[PDB]
Amino acid sequence: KKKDNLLFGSIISAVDPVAVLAVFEEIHKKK
C-alpha cells in the first residue's frame, strides 16, 4: 500500500480501444 502518485491515470486511463487500435492493429498483424 504505497505510491499514492497516479495522476497520470487521469490521462492514460482515458485511452480507449480506438486509441489502442492504431497500435493493436500492428500487433495482431505481426503475431
Q: Is 22 exposed, middle or buried (0-12, 13-18, 19+ CB in 10 A)?
A: exposed
The three cell numbers locating residue 19: 486509441
CA atoms within 13 A on the CB side of 8: 5
Q: Nearest-CA neighbor of 15 among 2, 5, 24?
A: 24
The single residue listed with the C-alpha cell 492504431 is 22
The CA-to-CA distance between both ends of the chain, in Å, stands at 37
How was this entry determined?
Answer: NMR
The single residue listed with the C-alpha cell 489502442 is 20
In angstroms, the CA 9 to CA 30 distance is: 28
What number of H helices and E strands is found in the chain? Answer: 2, 0
Q: Nearest-CA neighbor of 28 among 3, 9, 20, 18?
A: 20
